[model samples]
Target chain A: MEVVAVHVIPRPHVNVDAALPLGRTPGMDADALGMIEVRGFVGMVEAADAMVKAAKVELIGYEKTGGGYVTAVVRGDVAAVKAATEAGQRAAERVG
Target chain B: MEVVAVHVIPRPHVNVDAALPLGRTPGMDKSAGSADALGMIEVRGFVGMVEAADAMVKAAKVELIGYEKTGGGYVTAVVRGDVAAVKAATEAGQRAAERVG
Candidate 1:
């Protein structure tokens, strides 16, 4: 007599929660939050780069609000956030 | 020495994930993802965007896909339907945005 064993593997679950973090970061908290909104994609990237370089802040995340609009968010002390946001805005305007 | 429990609490982490759901309610995804014709109008403010969207939907048989608010006071309204309806809605939306501005 011969016996055979069959094993089955379960597939991953499909949930909105699973896709929630697709384009997001874990967490970067600070004394304050700064944001810069740009007109175009290139402008947004430039803004984000300038923001981090201008002050001691973390590039927390960004949002693409369609219609060629994008925004970058930063986290740091109040002064740092303020400086970073200003730098970001300048960069965006210059590039856009 | 006195111990001060700073308890920073991490300063309440900031992330774009928090605002991802704004103006993007469920059920509206269907028309947004699959529509015969699509129309979009970008405005400068929230009030103008709402006016555009309302006009678009009221002027023709178009579905209000969604409105996207790109920071810096930029807002865009999207609608969908048949080609003719989309065109009509687009024209109406454009007019509404201009009028509101």
Candidate 2:
């Protein structure tokens, strides 16, 4: 039930009309991508559940690194992602 | 990584085909995935995936085959090279990814 790392990358808050060339999301703070890496599938679920539930951030997907660790990714405003990360980190820690 | 409690949500807020491009990637390596010797390096985040894929080809004679997700949240990147070159590339990519996250 370990959290490997909670990482977030902030993109310039783009206008709704002008989306990022990379396209983080179609709805909101598209490019502001954040990732939370947690070990164990069960903890991945817990961390991800807490993440989107706590903030307006959208759950993009997960990266299955295997050998242990997995990465739960999200997209939203820097503030939202940060808040989501904090929430997820706490939830996963409880599992630990 | 510790295995903890598992549960589900109320309803589906996601789409079907929209959930494509994932889960179909647990493909094999060697024959169906890569022709030459395959080397895999996995990292927790996209930053690491990008950084590692770059270093993988730059440091050795490897062809970057993008990233693959098995489960949980770990993404694995693969490369194709003949034996020794694959070993070289995997070594380089592993270091690159480790530094990113």
Candidate 3:
């Protein structure tokens, strides 16, 4: 894969009515948040699958940072989130 | 730059308790909001995508929504505006990406 340095730009100002929702689901709160960033789509799926299967954590959302970095987010009790993130990291490594 | 194909994935299911928040801010509703046209241009790198986004907004009356990086060096710049403005911005973004390379 070609490597390119990543840069972030501030979002342009816009009216509140024109902005997109932050993408978070309402009424969804957890004790902790866990994230696992992997290098491929398949690895991302594997990570999320293993995470939810390994614990009682929720798979909240996914964030993609170009150049093959796909991050999976989870939330739940602290212990569960920790366990799930560990499981996800392991699964993604295995796939890679 | 080497070009690779792109693909999108469907999210998996999880319990309300286990699932992460949708990355959206609460009380920030968009379902009944203004109807703006959307446009996106996927490029091969971060610099290219940022450049595309800047060019797009400057080229037309469009607002930069956000950008997404879809691994393997792929990045996409998203924008919103009126239909005509969106079209113009997208075209400008494409041109900028080509120029950046």
True contacts kept of each: 0.14, 0.25, 0.34
Per-residue lDDT of candidate 2, residues A30-64 (tens digit): 35666677667788788889999999988867755
lDDT of 1 at A63: 63
Task: State the DockQ, from 0 to 1, for candidate 1.
Answer: 0.09
| Candidate 2 clashing pairs, residues 3+ apart or interchain | A1-B2, A63-B73, A63-B74, A64-B74, A65-B74, A70-B73, A70-B74, A71-B73, A71-B74
On a 0 to 100 scale, what is the lDDT of residue B84 in model 3?
Answer: 81
- Residue-by-residue lDDT tens digits, candidate 3, B1-101: 22222221122233321342322232355662434556777766554555566677778887776665556757666776677887888777777666642
lDDT per prediction?
0.54, 0.60, 0.57
Q: For candidate 1, lDDT tens digit of each residue in B1-101?
A: 11100010111112211223222232455554422454566556678778878988999997886765565666666665777787788777777766763
Better of 1 and 3 by lDDT: 3
Task: List, for all models, the DockQ compared with the true complex.
Answer: 0.09, 0.13, 0.15
- Give the DockQ-based CAPRI class for model 1: incorrect
TM-score of 1: 0.39
- Provide the lDDT at A38 for model 1: 53
Give TM-scores for every candidate, taking all chains together and pairing residue i with residue i: 0.39, 0.48, 0.41
Stretch of 10 with least lDDT, candidate 2 chain A: A13-22
DockQ measured for candidate 2: 0.13
Q: Tell me how far the alpha carbon of residue B17 in candidate 2 is from the true structure, in angstroms, after superposition.
A: 31
Candidate 3 lDDT, tens digit per residue, A45-84? 8878998999997776665665666656666777787788
